[PDB]
């Protein structure tokens, strides 16, 4: 036991030394020679009403028009952002939903929560009514996040400190991702969908290969649990959000932190993190009832999206980058432009 | 300006809004209360009693009494970092806490079961999400406490205890110790009841506590109290 523990410590030290040896410069020094962005002003365009409880999750559609929001009143509403009209209303069998997902093709949606079951609903049945197509069971903890890889398979996160890849047709998980010491809170899929990153309560972010089902890289540096994670549009980097009121950027190829986004006057945690279409701006939600826009390349605040009367729980940028929608616990979802 | 299909979609959206409003109106009249404790603490017994009078995850129980609807949630099986989902019950009307009165002289793999129960009660009561939420405390195993106290002194659990060994004194001391854990006494109140094989009075006590809590909340809303 002692020999293997010392070998593990030596390997950690070797990894740290190799990571340090490649830190010849920093992102801030390189980006000091480019013009900064101006004051970003966004005006709310639509105020989607109808939810009578806290908003916990939302996801933008591939068409950049339809979006689905999740609330703990037992209802999933598909909104027409262009006209505000409600498309569908799905009464959940469980009112404790904590996450929701929208299929890239739009034929199915998924959600989960304290029930430890991920339910997939078919939105294009011949009968015209939305019905549950498959229920994914096997997790021993609450579902934290879920994202559709395609119409046939889905990847989900659970509070049992493991992530699993599920086959909707078969109904049984094909791969299990173990290694996290704490509950997994968020998931993010790379543009190519070949690999994904997950954040857990252990203040560490792990890189998982979908096909091989093994951990590729591990990232650390946060002083508290990580709540949000999102891939950079290029796919070679990702950002994370933690309760320590700080956002950190990591690079897959450099395997180390690039830049840190934090302010002295921000003391509350971070709920959601998202990237702009070009990656120039980083949007993150905070428990202080507003969302702050951060300059990715300079760590300089770009703007604040105020107007929510409660905690901002989730946010997302449209696939086309036209607008960004923000959810909050006040039962109201707003679209900014 | 809207087309015929646009008008039809607007009408469908209005119908969906009406349905959502009806569902919200139905839900707003239902009492939601959370249950906490340990498996041996009597949660199963309480749930079975309530259900009779009227797999991993959280168990939801529905029962009605005196034309009042109650929704009880059990989260015992959900062993995890509770602070990540305890906030989901911020709107809970009341919290039910079950503790076995006879586990004062038992040990757990805190070492003592009773000490762990008091620690959990202190953690839940002082939680930032339940500052204004009342707690109902149930003592489930007084019948076996009668046998245990007459043979095993209570000093094993509370060394500071120096009162009489009678059952009444021990029960009063336990109740006082459990009640003193409240640091927000001004903002919230704890209702203490003793449960046994007798099942008639538990539902009535729960209904009375719920009604009193709702009355206090309404008085807060109007400005009084």
């Amino acid at each position, epitope marked *: 036991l002692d020999q293997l523990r010392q070998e593990a410590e030596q390997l950690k030290n070797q990894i740290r030394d190799a990571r340090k040896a490649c830190a010849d410069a920093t992102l801030s020094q390189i980006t000091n020679n480019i013009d900064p962005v101006g004051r970003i002003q966004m005006r709310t365009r639509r105020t989607l009403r109808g939810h009578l409880a806290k908003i916990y999750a939302m996801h933008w559609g591939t068409d950049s028009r339809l979006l689905v929001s999740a609330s703990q009143d037992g209802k999933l509403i598909i909104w027409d952002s262009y006209t505000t009209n409600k498309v569908h209303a799905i009464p959940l069998r469980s009112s404790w939903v904590m996450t929701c997902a929208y299929a890239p093709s739009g034929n199915y949606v998924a959600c989960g929560g304290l029930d430890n079951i991920c339910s997939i609903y078919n939105l294009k049945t011949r009968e015209g009514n939305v019905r549950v197509s498959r229920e994914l069971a096997g997790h021993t903890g609450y579902l934290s996040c879920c994202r559709f890889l395609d119409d046939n398979q889905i990847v989900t996160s659970s509070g049992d400190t493991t992530c699993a890849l599920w086959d909707i047709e078969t109904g049984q998980q094909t791969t299990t991702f173990t290694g996290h010491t704490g509950d997994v809170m968020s998931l993010s899929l790379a543009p190519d969908t070949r690999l994904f990153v997950s954040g857990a309560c252990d203040a560490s972010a792990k890189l998982w290969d979908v096909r091989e089902g093994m951990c590729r890289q591990t990232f650390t540096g946060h002083e508290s649990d990580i709540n949000a994670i999102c891939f950079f549009p290029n796919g070679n980097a990702f950002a994370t959000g933690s309760d320590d009121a700080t956002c950190r950027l990591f690079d897959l190829r450099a395997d180390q932190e690039l830049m840190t986004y934090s302010h002295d006057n921000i003391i509350c945690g971070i709920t959601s993190v998202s990237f702009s279409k070009s990656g120039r701006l980083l949007l993150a939600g905070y428990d202080d009832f507003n969302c702050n826009v951060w300059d990715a390349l300079k760590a300089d605040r770009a703007g604040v999206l105020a107007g929510h009367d409660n905690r901002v729980s989730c946010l997302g940028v449209t696939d086309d980058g036209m607008a960004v929608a923000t959810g909050s616990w006040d039962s109201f979802l707003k679209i900014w432009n | 300006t809207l*087309s*015929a*299909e646009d008008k039809a979609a607007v009408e469908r959206s209005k119908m969906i809004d009406r349905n959502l409003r009806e569902d919200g109106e139905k839900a707003a009249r239902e009492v939601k209360l959370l249950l906490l404790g340990a498996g041996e603490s009597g949660k199963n017994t309480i749930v079975k009693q309530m259900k009779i009078i009227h797999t991993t995850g959280i168990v939801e129980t529905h029962f009605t009494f005196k034309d009042l609807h109650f929704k009880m949630f059990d989260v015992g099986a959900q062993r995890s970092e509770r602070k990540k989902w305890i906030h989901c019950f911020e709107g809970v009307t009341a919290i039910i806490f079950c503790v076995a009165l006879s586990d004062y002289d038992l040990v757990l793999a805190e070492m003592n079961r009773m000490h762990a129960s008091m620690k959990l009660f202190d953690s839940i009561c002082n939680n930032k999400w339940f500052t204004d939420t009342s707690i109902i405390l149930f003592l489930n195993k007084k019948d076996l406490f009668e046998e245990k106290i007459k043979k095993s002194p209570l000093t094993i659990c509370y060394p500071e205890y120096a009162g009489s060994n009678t059952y009444e004194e021990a029960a009063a001391y336990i109740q006082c110790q459990f009640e003193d854990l409240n640091k927000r006494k001004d903002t919230k109140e704890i209702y203490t009841h003793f449960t046994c094989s007798t099942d008639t009075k538990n539902v009535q006590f729960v209904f009375d506590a719920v009604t009193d809590v709702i009355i206090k909340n309404n008085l807060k809303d109007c400005g009084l109290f």
Partner: single-chain antibody
Amino acid sequence: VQLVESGGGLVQPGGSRKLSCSASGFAFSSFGMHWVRQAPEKGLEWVAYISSGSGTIYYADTVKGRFTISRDDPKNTLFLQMTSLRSEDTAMYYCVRSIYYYGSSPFDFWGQGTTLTVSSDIVMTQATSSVPVTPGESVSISCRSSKSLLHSNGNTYLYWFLQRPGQSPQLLIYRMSNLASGVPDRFSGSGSGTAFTLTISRLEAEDVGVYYCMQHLEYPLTFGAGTKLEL
């Protein structure tokens, strides 16, 4: 999903008749309903429509007042009260589903229909009446409208229907090139403003029938004269 119309038979002009249709296999409550008339050797014609919840009702100018249309969601039944009948009312009546939401495909399902025998609007036209053609060869059918169907929202409200011999009309394309569910990719649509064309890559025996172009921009709905393919 099945729709079975009821009622009909010989009725005198001074009499009355009540047509009833039974719906099953789908959420009838959430679906709008339409009645379509097809007199012998004549084309289709719209009668009335009921929105979900019976909140909105429309009638054709030729049937307004005479016909009272009602709905009964609990029994999944639709009724058409014809207080006064005339000679031109002798036609086969079809019941058609309709659901209106973003991405929806209304008029997707048509009932078998019942036969009743009795003892401004946008004009839709099809220049070609009969187009003889052998199997395999591509076929093109054109439809034109007196008013532009391109609404400001950015989509044209045009529908294409095919009625096989002895069968009810079947939806093919909606607004205005999207392929209806279950139809082969063989069917494609195109157009701009007022000129539209329906093309078949390679014709097969199952394509024999009559094609109707319908506009859904403004009520009352109108149907084209109809182009027949024969071999």
